[PDB]
Amino acid sequence: GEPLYTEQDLAVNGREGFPNYRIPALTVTPDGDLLASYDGRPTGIDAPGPNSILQRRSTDGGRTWGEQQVVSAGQTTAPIKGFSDPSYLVDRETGTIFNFHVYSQRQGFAGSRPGTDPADPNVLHANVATSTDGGLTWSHRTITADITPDPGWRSRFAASGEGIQLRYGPHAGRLIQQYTIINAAGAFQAVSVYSDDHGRTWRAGEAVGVGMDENKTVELSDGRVLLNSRDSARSGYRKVAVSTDGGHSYGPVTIDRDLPDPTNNASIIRAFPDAPAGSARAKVLLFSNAASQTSRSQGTIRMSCDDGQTWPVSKVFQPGSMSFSTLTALPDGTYGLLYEPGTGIRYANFNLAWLGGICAPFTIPDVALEPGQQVTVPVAVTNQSGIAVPKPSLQLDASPDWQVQGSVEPLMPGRQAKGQVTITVPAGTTPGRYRVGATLRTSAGNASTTFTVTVGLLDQARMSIADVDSEETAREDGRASNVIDGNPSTFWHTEWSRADAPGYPHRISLDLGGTHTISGLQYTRRQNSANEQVADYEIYTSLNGTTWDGPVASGRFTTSLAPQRAVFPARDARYIRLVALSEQTGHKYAAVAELEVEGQR
Ligand SMILES: CC(=O)N[C@H]1[C@H]([C@H](O)[C@H](O)CO)OC(C(=O)O)=C[C@@H]1O
Ligand code: NA
Numbered sequence: 001g002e003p004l005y006t007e008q009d010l011a012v013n014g015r016e017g018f019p020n021y022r023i024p025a026l027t028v029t030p031d032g033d034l035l036a037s038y039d040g041r042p043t044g045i046d047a048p049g050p051n052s053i054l055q056r057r058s059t060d061g062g063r064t065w066g067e068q069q070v071v072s073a074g075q076t077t078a079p080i081k082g083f084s085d086p087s088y089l090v091d092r093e094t095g096t097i098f099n100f101h102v103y104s105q106r107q108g109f110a111g112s113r114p115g116t117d118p119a120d121p122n123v124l125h126a127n128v129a130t131s132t133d134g135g136l137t138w139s140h141r142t143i144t145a146d147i148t149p150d151p152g153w154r155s156r157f158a159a160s161g162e163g164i165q166l167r168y169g170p171h172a173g174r175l176i177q178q179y180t181i182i183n184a185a186g187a188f189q190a191v192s193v194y195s196d197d198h199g200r201t202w203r204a205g206e207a208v209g210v211g212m213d214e215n216k217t218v219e220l221s222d223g224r225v226l227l228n229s230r231d232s233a234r235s236g237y238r239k240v241a242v243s244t245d246g247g248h249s250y251g252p253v254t255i256d257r258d259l260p261d262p263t264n265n266a267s268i269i270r271a272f273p274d275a276p277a278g279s280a281r282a283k284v285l286l287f288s289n290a291a292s293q294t295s296r297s298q299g300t301i302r303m304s305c306d307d308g309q310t311w312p313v314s315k316v317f318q319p320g321s322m323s324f325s326t327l328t329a330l331p332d333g334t335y336g337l338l339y340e341p342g343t344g345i346r347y348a349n350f351n352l353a354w355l356g357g358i359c360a361p362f363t364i365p366d367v368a369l370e371p372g373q374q375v376t377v378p379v380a381v382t383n384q385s386g387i388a389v390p391k392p393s394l395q396l397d398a399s400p401d402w403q404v405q406g407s408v409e410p411l412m413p414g415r416q417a418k419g420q421v422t423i424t425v426p427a428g429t430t431p432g433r434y435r436v437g438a439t440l441r442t443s444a445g446n447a448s449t450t451f452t453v454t455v456g457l458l459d460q461a462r463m464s465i466a467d468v469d470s471e472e473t474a475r476e477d478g479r480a481s482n483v484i485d486g487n488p489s490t491f492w493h494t495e496w497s498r499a500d501a502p503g504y505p506h507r508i509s510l511d512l513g514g515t516h517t518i519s520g521l522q523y524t525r526r527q528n529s530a531n532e533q534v535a536d537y538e539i540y541t542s543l544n545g546t547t548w549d550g551p552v553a554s555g556r557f558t559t560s561l562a563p564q565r566a567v568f569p570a571r572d573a574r575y576i577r578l579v580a581l582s583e584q585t586g587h588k589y590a591a592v593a594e595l596e597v598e599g600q601r
Helices: 480-484
Strands: 005-012 021-028 034-040 052-058 069-072 082-090 097-104 125-131 139-142 155-158 175-182 188-195 215-219 225-229 237-243 254-260 267-270 285-290 297-304 313-321 325-329 335-339 344-350 367-369 374-382 393-397 403-408 416-424 432-442 445-455 464-468 506-525 536-542 548-556 564-580 591-599
Touching: 005 034, 005 052, 021 325, 021 335, 021 344, 034 082, 034 335, 034 344, 052 082, 052 097, 069 082, 069 097, 069 125, 082 155, 082 175, 097 155, 097 175, 125 155, 175 215, 188 225, 215 267, 267 325, 285 325, 285 335, 313 445, 367 374, 374 403, 393 416, 403 432, 464 480, 480 506, 480 591, 506 536, 548 564, 564 591
Parallel strands: 021 082, 367 445
Antiparallel strands: 005 344, 021 034, 034 052, 052 069, 082 097, 097 125, 125 139, 155 175, 175 188, 215 225, 225 237, 237 254, 267 285, 285 297, 297 313, 325 335, 335 344, 374 416, 393 403, 393 432, 403 416, 432 445, 464 506, 506 564, 506 591, 536 548, 536 564
């Protein structure tokens, strides 16, 4: 219907008792009252800041808000106490409300030491406040010893925002709160902490993943539990995993390249949390995060209508500063959104009509071509909307001088639709990888996708590592093969975890999988770190793998984050070798996110 988006501040830094306010948690009580919670930070820091958990209630569906109250009061006088990083969880069967948060004294998350005793001042404790009166008053407990079944778990905190209650399946009624832990190897792991007796007792399931951080769970149309996590190893995306046992244990963790993220919190909720299992509505998810890889800005709502397999719909709600954000579904069918604009804590309301999307995810294959050429690629629209669309159009976004055009056949409820894109690349186009955005426009809303057009590059999927001088595999994944996976987010990194690792020169050699006319190498430096950057280099080629011709090119790369070209007169080769002679500021290691080869495939 009529689009709604409205916003109001609930806490402004410096006003009402605190110089800084952060870390939003938002819920709707069984009453329909809204509760917003967040930290008061007297010293403006995370734990062990002597922080308070605070709370405002709205009893008119979000429009006006009552006084800021204290849920858990920090102690600014020695001995210091801090309570920080709230997450609400409503038990909608009993009505009891929970607010999870840290109890810190001397140590925060990084500094916490092994041990579970409630009074240990060097332990970052796991606390929870329980309300049996709709969030008006609160009792308090430390559950650290209940949720630390591994003595090597020296640290934990509840991921702030909002936990869930399961509605489906053998574990219906389970309360699930996400936590992050630090194990004895010092890896950050995710784990669900859950209660099956309505909050009386809590336990941890099995920890999952490495390079995890604040993570969130949601129940899918089929009762599976989807985990969606911040990556503390800073890939520039979200991490994901799924459980088939109600949160007890998760399958393998993967990087989700549909969801750019700058290492920041986020929220994932059911659009229709009361929809029955397996129903079309049960499959609808909303996601909120900063949709940038390098900054906490471009806050964006995405929608999936297939239990999170695809995210065809997105809309920006905050082009500027946008840090933590947390969604909840309101009784009136609209959505609550509590987030950090930079000046404290702000609350927004929006409806689906504002989002403006259509559940019609679509695919366009990646395609490779030569300068000058024209190719037509197929478009497949999977229509999940249930509605007929007689006049879809496809709008494409490509290089300013490329000829692109597209079209889609009418959409039919429950059916796949065919389309086509025709692309002409002008002669003289620089070899490289080109992202093309595509929008499906309909009177019932829009969906989008991207696809890659490769001009004058060899196919990486035919390549393999012929040799490498050095690679770290023990303390991180710096495999040489990471240069040819088509992902700027994974990288080769020379060995670093032993002191006897070599320094420069470093060397990586690719087998192209067969002989090609080649004329260039494209280097992309590591994206999330700046002290392993190749400077001086040479490139050699070979027909047999053993007799190397060259250097066929040499120079000095810049610090640019974009692919860098090193071109050479065209020749036939089956192998190409990069010799990295130096690092930009004289450091010991090399790291390369991607190597592309210019040539006739
Ligand atoms: C328990 C406390 O540390 N939580 C902090 C959390 C944490 O330090 C980090 O997630 C560790 O990786 O980070 C952030 C952040 O804005 O980045 C805010 C939190 O209040
Ligand atoms: Na890579």
